Design a protein around this ligand. Structure first.
Ligand SMILES: [Zn+2]
Length: 97
DNA sequence: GCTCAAGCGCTCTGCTCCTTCTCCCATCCTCTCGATGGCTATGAGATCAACTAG
């Protein structure tokens, strides 16, 4: 099976995904023109398209942390995460021994 | 410009981690080997309460 989703470039999606295509969500069977064979699936996609159409001065201490690179560092550098890093490594140390 | 908001710092748990601290480790029996263990004097003053007379 193929996603066969209608891309903005006019070509059907050729991604080979078992269940879900990341750029188009769930994968449903489609014909040569990229139309879902199930009429219910066509209606659901139309509803999704309608929903999409409907849709001091200096950075404070909290505002400075509000970004991408800080968020990933906070998750990586955590008391529970570091302990889980050690705890996971302890279990392979038992396997190594 | 008059009310709901947005924040906001301060406080209250609280949640887990790390550290610290006390206890605990079968029963009974025999024997030997060692260690330990203390031992100033003598006299002077002064008080006091009990006999021994008065
Ligand atoms: Zn796709």
């Amino acid at each position: 099976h193929w996603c066969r989703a209608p891309r903005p470039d006019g070509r059907l999606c050729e991604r080979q995904d078992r269940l879900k295509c990341p750029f188009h969500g769930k994968i449903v069977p489609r014909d040569d023109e990229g139309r879902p064979l199930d009429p219910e699936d066509r209606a659901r996609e139309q509803r999704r398209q309608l929903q999409k159409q409907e849709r001091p001065s200096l950075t404070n201490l909290k505002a400075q942390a509000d970004t991408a690179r800080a968020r990933i560092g906070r998750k990586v550098f955590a008391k529970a995460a570091v302990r889980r890093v050690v705890a996971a490594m302890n279990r392979m140390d038992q396997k190594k021994h």
